[PDB]
Structure 1
Amino acid sequence: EMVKKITSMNRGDFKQITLATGAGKTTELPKAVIEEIGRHKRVLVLIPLRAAAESVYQYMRLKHPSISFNLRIGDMKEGDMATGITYASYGYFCQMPQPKLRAAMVEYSYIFLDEYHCATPEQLAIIGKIHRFSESIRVVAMTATHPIEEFIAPEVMKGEDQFLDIAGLKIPVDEMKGNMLVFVPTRNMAVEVAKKLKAKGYNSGYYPANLRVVTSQSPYVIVATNAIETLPDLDTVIDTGLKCEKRVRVSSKIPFIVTGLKRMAVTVGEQAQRRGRVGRVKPGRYYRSQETATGSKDYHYDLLQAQRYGIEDGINVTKSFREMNYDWSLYEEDSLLITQLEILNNLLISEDLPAAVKNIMARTDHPEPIQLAYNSYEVQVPVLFPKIRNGEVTDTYENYSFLNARKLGEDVPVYIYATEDEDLAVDLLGLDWPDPGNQQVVETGKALKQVTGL
């Protein structure tokens, strides 16, 4: 039925498709579109995960031997002209330079965007990069967006006397005749307060081989992280409603960009994963905490990692994102931070990147190679900041391949981009970030003070 909606479209129109019925919104809708449009025509489907693109590819070449199917999760294909439907990852087209990306994308009758709501750096790069020639393409963006009892589990006050201590959540002792699953933010608590249940008397386990031995005996009470990737006869769910995910702080004073792991609330979909862990077998329970699960995923960190894919081509990934989201209306905007990340994206690409630094990004194991690109405007040698452990300065450092870095000492560098832990060392060692020495970063700073005021 939605086929004649999709087949109304000219080159230069976009549609958002909400419906996600059956085991394949991304399987059945393009099938129906290529039935109507013809097997002589190439159709593109873009899937976040590499494995999901392969899984859907295997299933569709099996259910449908009349229609041709193609997989693109690896290396580039030059002059690629496969005539059927193509299941590809976003990372695949993220290899492509802008002439090649254009040359690839105009060759399709339709381009289907699957699970745009994940907002991975490869996703935000692609969707922003294709909107640059939005006039030449037909773009369709689709998404997904037994009894369970609701109680907001109340927070435990310090020094307080039919309840048990579960990381500051009030859950009754009577619910320890069942089988319960604890969701926690810190990668540390799932070792510690999971040990505590065993130190209280409750049979417990953390986050494969250790899981199989733990799962068999009862009562079982497990503390776990975000691993949907079901469960042996799960009775009850407890949720702290929080997670540990990356944030980006922007300031007009050095360091301009600060990033790191932070305790933030989950989304509605990410909560539905926690709400939907029990129930299917028998009517189970749900105990969340007193924080609102957000409507959208806060993507601003991934948007920063996304800027890396615009450097070689000279594309402002953040500018390209802003305009795409004005036309297509895919995501929620924090106007101020988006506006702030843009001026930094003007700094990032204001100059040609030095050939040496352009090598280091490609071959290193640094989790944030973008940090090297931002700091190259002020620093010619990367700086090893002493690692922070349990909020305190250590003697340990990060050994990252190809960095050729200088250890901090007391010499504090002029950094445009820093980490919370790097910023904390400078607080705690009793030290100060110096002022900008390069005028282009001065210019960016003046601009960021201006855009916060309004």
Structure 2
Amino acid sequence: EMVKKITSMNRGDFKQITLATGAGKTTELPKAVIEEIGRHKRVLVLIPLRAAAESVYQYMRLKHPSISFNLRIGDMKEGDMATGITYASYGYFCQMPQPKLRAAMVEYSYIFLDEYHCATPEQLAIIGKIHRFSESIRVVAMTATHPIEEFIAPEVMKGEDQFLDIAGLKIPVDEMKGNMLVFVPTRNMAVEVAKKLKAKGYNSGYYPANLRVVTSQSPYVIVATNAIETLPDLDTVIDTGLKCEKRVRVSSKIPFIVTGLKRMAVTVGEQAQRRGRVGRVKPGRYYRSQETATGSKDYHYDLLQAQRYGIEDGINVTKSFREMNYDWSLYEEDSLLITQLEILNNLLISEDLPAAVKNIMARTDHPEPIQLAYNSYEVQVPVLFPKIRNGEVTDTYENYSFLNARKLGEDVPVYIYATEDEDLAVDLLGLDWPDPGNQQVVETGKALKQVTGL
């Protein structure tokens, strides 16, 4: 039925498709579109995960031997002209330079965007990069967006006397005749307060081989992280409603960009994963905490990692994102931070990147190679900041391949981009970030003070 909606479209129109019925919104809708449009025509489907693109590819070449199917999760294909439907990852087209990306994308009758709501750096790069020639393409963006009892589990006050201590959540002792699953933010608590249940008397386990031995005996009470990737006869769910995910702080004073792991609330979909862990077998329970699960995923960190894919081509990934989201209306905007990340994206690409630094990004194991690109405007040698452990300065450092870095000492560098832990060392060692020495970063700073005021 939605086929004649999709087949109304000219080159230069976009549609958002909400419906996600059956085991394949991304399987059945393009099938129906290529039935109507013809097997002589190439159709593109873009899937976040590499494995999901392969899984859907295997299933569709099996259910449908009349229609041709193609997989693109690896290396580039030059002059690629496969005539059927193509299941590809976003990372695949993220290899492509802008002439090649254009040359690839105009060759399709339709381009289907699957699970745009994940907002991975490869996703935000692609969707922003294709909107640059939005006039030449037909773009369709689709998404997904037994009894369970609701109680907001109340927070435990310090020094307080039919309840048990579960990381500051009030859950009754009577619910320890069942089988319960604890969701926690810190990668540390799932070792510690999971040990505590065993130190209280409750049979417990953390986050494969250790899981199989733990799962068999009862009562079982497990503390776990975000691993949907079901469960042996799960009775009850407890949720702290929080997670540990990356944030980006922007300031007009050095360091301009600060990033790191932070305790933030989950989304509605990410909560539905926690709400939907029990129930299917028998009517189970749900105990969340007193924080609102957000409507959208806060993507601003991934948007920063996304800027890396615009450097070689000279594309402002953040500018390209802003305009795409004005036309297509895919995501929620924090106007101020988006506006702030843009001026930094003007700094990032204001100059040609030095050939040496352009090598280091490609071959290193640094989790944030973008940090090297931002700091190259002020620093010619990367700086090893002493690692922070349990909020305190250590003697340990990060050994990252190809960095050729200088250890901090007391010499504090002029950094445009820093980490919370790097910023904390400078607080705690009793030290100060110096002022900008390069005028282009001065210019960016003046601009960021201006855009916060309004």
| TMscore range, shorter length | over 0.9
Cα distance in 2 for residues equivalent to 1:186 and 1:241: 12
Secondary structure, counterpart of 1:279 in structure 2: coil
Report Cα offsets for 1:77-105 as digits up to 9, x if no partner. Answer: 00000000000000000000000000000
Aligned-residue offset at 1:131: 0.0
Aligned position for 1:82: 82
- 2-side partners of 1:127 and 1:338: how far apart? 16
Separation of aligned partners in 2, 1:120 and 1:229: 17
Instruction: Say which SS state the counterpart of residue 366 (structure 1) adopts.
Output: coil
**Which string of whole-angstrom CA distances, capped at 9 and with x for unpartnered residues, describes residues 104-126 of structure 1?**
00000000000000000000000
1:26-75 Cα distance to aligned partner (Å, 9 max, x none): 00000000000000000000000000000000000000000000000000
Return the alpha-carbon distance in structure 2 between the equivalents of residues 311 and 259 of structure 1.
Answer: 20
Inter-partner Cα distance in structure 2 for 1:440 and 1:207: 45
Matched residue pairs, number?
Answer: 454
* Aligned-residue offset at 1:199: 0.0
SS in 1 for 2:207: coil
Q: CA deviation at 1:239?
A: 0.0
| TM norm structure 1 | 1.00
SS at match of 1:440: helix
Secondary structure of residue in 1 paired with 2:341: helix
Q: 2:347, 2:87 → 1: CA distance?
A: 36
Match of 2:260 in 1: 260
Partner of 2:165: 165
CA distance in structure 2 between the aligned counterparts of 1:189 and 1:289, rounded to whole angstroms: 17
Per-residue deviation, 1:220 = 0.0
2:85 and 2:235 map into 1 onto residues whose CA distance is 42
Counterparts of 1:445 and 1:154, CA distance in 2 = 43
| Superposed displacement of residue 295, structure 1 | 0.0
- Report the 3-state secondary structure (helix = DSSP H, G, I; strand = E; otherwise coil) of the residue aligned with 1:410: coil
Q: Distance in 2 between matches of 1:64 and 1:231?
A: 33
Deviations along 1:150-174, one digit per CA (max 9) or x if unpaired, are 0000000000000000000000000
- Alpha-carbon distance in 1 for matches of 2:371, 2:24: 39
Q: Deviations over 1:165-186 (max 9, x none)?
A: 0000000000000000000000
- Which consecutive segments of 4 or more residues in structure 1 shift more than 4 A? none
Task: Measure how far apart 1:416 and its partner are.
Answer: 0.0
Residues 200-227 of structure 1, C-alpha deviation per residue, up to 9 Å, x if partnerless?
0000000000000000000000000000
- 1:446 maps onto 2:441 in alignment: no
In structure 2, distance between residues paired with 1:182 and 1:399: 34
Report the equivalent of 1:134.
134
- Alpha-carbon distance between aligned partners in 1 of 2:417 and 2:33, rounded to the nearest angstrom: 46
1:376 paired residue number:
376
SS of 1:190 mapped into structure 2:
helix
What is the CA-CA distance between 1:134 and the residue it aligns to?
0.0
Q: Separation in 1 of the partners of 2:169 and 2:441? A: 46
SS of aligned partner of 2:424: helix
- Alpha-carbon distance in structure 2 between the residues aligned to 1:220 and 1:203: 5
**Structure 2: distance between partners of 1:131 and 1:379:** 34
* C-alpha distance after superposition, 1:411-437 (max 9, x if no partner): 000000000000000000000000000
* Cα deviation, residue 398, structure 1: 0.0
Deviation at 1:306, TM superposition (A): 0.0
- Distance between the aligned counterparts of 2:188 and 2:43, measured in 1? 45
Residues of 2 paired with 1:78 and 1:22: CA distance?
A: 35
Deviation at 1:148, TM superposition (A): 0.0
Distance in 2, Cα, partners of 1:88 & 1:263? 33
SS of the counterpart of 2:246?
strand
Q: CA deviation at 1:240?
A: 0.0
Deviation, 1:330, is 0.0
Offset, 1:3:
0.0
- RMSD across aligned positions (CA): 0.0
Corresponding residue number in structure 1 for 2:180: 180
Deviations 1:345-399 (A, max 9, x none): 0000000000000000000000000000000000000000000000000000000
1:120 corresponds to: 120
In structure 2, distance between residues paired with 1:112 and 1:260: 33
Which residue does the alignment assign to 1:349? 349
Q: Secondary structure at the match of 2:302?
A: helix
Equivalent residue of 1:88, what SS? strand
Task: Map residues 273-288 of structure 1 onto 2, 5 A cutoff.
Answer: 273-288=273-288
Counterpart-to-counterpart distance in 2, 1:94 and 1:392: 39
* Structure 2 SS opposite 1:182: strand
How far does residue 15 in structure 1 lie from its aligned partner after superposition? Answer: 0.0
Q: Distance in 1 between matches of 2:186 and 2:398?
A: 21
1:230 corresponds in structure 2 to 230
Distance in 1, Cα, partners of 2:250 & 2:418? 10
Quote the residue 1:408 is aligned against.
408
Query: How much has 1:242 moved relative to structure 2?
Result: 0.0
Matches of 1:278 and 1:127 in 2, distance apart?
Answer: 35
- In the TM superposition, what is the alpha-carbon distance from 1:303 to its structure 2 partner? 0.0
CA distance in 2, matches of 1:126, 1:17: 19
What SS does the aligned partner of 1:12 have? Answer: coil
Distance in 2, Cα, partners of 1:117 & 1:160: 41
- In structure 2, C-alpha distance between the alignment counterparts of 1:56 and 1:143, rounded to whole Å: 16
Following TM superposition, by how much is the alpha carbon of 1:301 offset from its aligned partner in structure 2, in angstroms?
Answer: 0.0
Aligned-pair distance for 1:17? 0.0
Q: Which digits, 9 at most, give the CA deviation of each residue in 1:300-341, with x for residues without a partner?
A: 000000000000000000000000000000000000000000
- SS at 1:46 equivalent: strand
Alpha-carbon distance in structure 1 between the residues aligned to 2:73 and 2:371: 27
What SS does the aligned partner of 2:425 have?
helix
SS at match of 1:223: strand
* 1:235 CA drift (Å): 0.0
TM-score, length basis structure 2: 1.00
State the alpha-carbon separation in 2 of the partners of residues 182 and 49 from structure 1: 27
Give the gaps of 5 or more residues in structure 1: none
Identity over aligned residues, as a percent?
100
